[PDB]
Amino acid sequence: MADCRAVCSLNTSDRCDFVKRNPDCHSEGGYLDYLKGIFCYFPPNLLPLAITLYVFWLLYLFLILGVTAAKFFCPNLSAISTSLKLSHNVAGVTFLAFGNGAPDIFSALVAFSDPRTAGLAIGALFGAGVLVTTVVAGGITILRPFMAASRPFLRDITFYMVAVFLTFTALYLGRITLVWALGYLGLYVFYVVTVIICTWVYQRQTTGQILLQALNPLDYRKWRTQSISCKLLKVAKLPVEFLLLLTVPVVDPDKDDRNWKRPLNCLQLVISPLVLVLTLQSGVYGIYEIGGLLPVWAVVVIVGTALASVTFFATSNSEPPRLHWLFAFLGFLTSALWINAAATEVVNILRSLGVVFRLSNTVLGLTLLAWGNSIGDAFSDFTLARQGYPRMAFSACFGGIIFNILVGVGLGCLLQIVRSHASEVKLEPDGLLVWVLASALGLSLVFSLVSVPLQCFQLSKAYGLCLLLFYICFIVVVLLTEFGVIHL
């Protein structure tokens, strides 16, 4: 019954027996068993190969998550938002917020679902908070000096500090009960209402050819125009976006036809329910048999092909039907399931690396999960600042993290409480590194709250350079205390 963190203190011939009958480290969900693979699929000689290969697979999964969220998830959420006839700011605080922060939220939802990994979620949430408010905001001001917006800044910084200190309290007590989770969700509702009300009160005051081009991930002219590095990224993510364009339908509101592609969409109307049944709960309910008479994948593919022929006959190949926002909805679902599968694999990899090297969940979440999840927003915000709109970038910077922390903790803990039939989610402490992380986030927030108003909201290079120096120093201190030079 030994904890399988004790697998590196065994004779190398008996690590198979341990890994294959110790139940302490069996992935809660997923497809690949990374720890049987790392220990006795590869020969003990070449352990560094297994770990280098796992790190490259982690990086490619982060690319998968970013590409899926930016190009397929968020436009479908926007299609639904426009279909419901909402304004710009309510949309940008609810639907576009969900779309922009998808990777963090799904990562927290997966980590909170298992007692052994719940320390990854806390580390990743606080670490992403520390990273976005120092490196991204600072870099935005270094790239371009601008005059920041007062009211969004003060609103966002105040709400974020309240949410953060509430989470420190929950960490200290050592638990999250469903009253606390419902409190997180209630605070989010109050934030959306205050944004709406403040912005209102201040405003008043041949088929086959089009199928082949539809499935074609790449355009000749742009690819011939970009540099070498952009070509390299495009060829890196070509398989990802081929599977995406093949299996998720995207409704786009700016277009005249609204990306209506009659053969492609009427074929995904068969392809996508199969992806749902195979991906939901990693397939257990997919292969489950009802009654022993009608198999499950068979019935879903049969009904899918029936209704795909039904819609193919009923529509012509020029003008969309009157109800393809349901294509928007169906695309939302299967984009969400793709993100869920990628996040489950990422969390399993990080857990296995923690078992092998006897690392802590806090440092793994603090560094690798946080950076991998924040690469997307960093890229988006820096591009927006360089184009000539740094007010928008600095606003979105502080606007995203509130949604992330609040919805992530709320939903993740609530769903764990519901499926587990428990009354609380225990937050066991991983040493005293969690309090170093907490104090780093706290002081960062305090520095921004004092500095930006005192500059009269005129931000420049000095502010960003100070924040960048602070982040480098914090990371060095974390690494030095994790590996045992400075012990607390």
Catalog residues that contact a second copy under the rule CB under 8 A.
139, 142-143, 432, 435-436, 439, 442-443, 446-447, 450-451, 454-455, 460-463, 465-466, 468-470, 472-473, 475-476, 479-480, 485-488
CB of 468 to a second copy, least distance (A): 6
**How far lies 305's CA from each of 197, 275, 301, 331, 399, in Å?**
47, 14, 6, 18, 43
Half-sphere exposure of 342 (CA within 13 A, CB side): 28
Which of 214/449 has CB closer to a second copy? 449
CB of 66 to a second copy, least distance (A): 21
Q: What's the angle, vertex CA 133, arms to CA 128 and CA 134, rounded to 5?
A: 100
Which of 8/480 has CB closer to a second copy? 480
How far is Cα of residue 83 from the mean position of the Cα atoms in its chain? 25
Which of 329/435 has CB closer to a second copy? 435
Name the token pair of 209: 């050819």
3-class DSSP state of 96: helix
The rounded distance, in Å, linking the Cα atoms of 272 and 468 is 44
User: 30 φ, ψ to 5°?
Assistant: 130, 180
Report which DSSP code applies to 248. -
CB of 480 to a second copy, least distance (A): 6
Helix (H) or strand (E) holding 88, with range, is: helix 88-111
Name the token pair of 94: 């609810």
Q: Where are the beta strands (DSSP E) in 12-150?
A: 146-147
CB of 479 to a second copy, least distance (A): 8
CB of 483 to a second copy, least distance (A): 9
Which of 363/406 has CB closer to a second copy? 363
Task: Compute the chain's Rg from CA coordinates.
Answer: 24
* Residues 54 and 34 sit within 8 Å (Cβ to Cβ): yes
Which of 218/469 has CB closer to a second copy? 469
Q: Look-up: residue for tokens 């074929």?
A: 267
CB of 371 to a second copy, least distance (A): 14
Helix (H) or strand (E) holding 331, with range, is: helix 325-357
CB of 380 to a second copy, least distance (A): 17
Which of 180/463 has CB closer to a second copy? 463
The rounded distance, in Å, linking the Cα atoms of 260 and 328 is 11
CB of 135 to a second copy, least distance (A): 9
Nearest Cα residue to 178 out of 407, 425, 402? 425
The rounded distance, in Å, linking the Cα atoms of 136 and 401 is 12
CB of 274 to a second copy, least distance (A): 46
* Residues 62 and 168 sit within 8 Å (Cβ to Cβ): no
CB of 115 to a second copy, least distance (A): 25
Which of 263/442 has CB closer to a second copy? 442
Strand partners, 176: 425
Report which DSSP code applies to 134. I
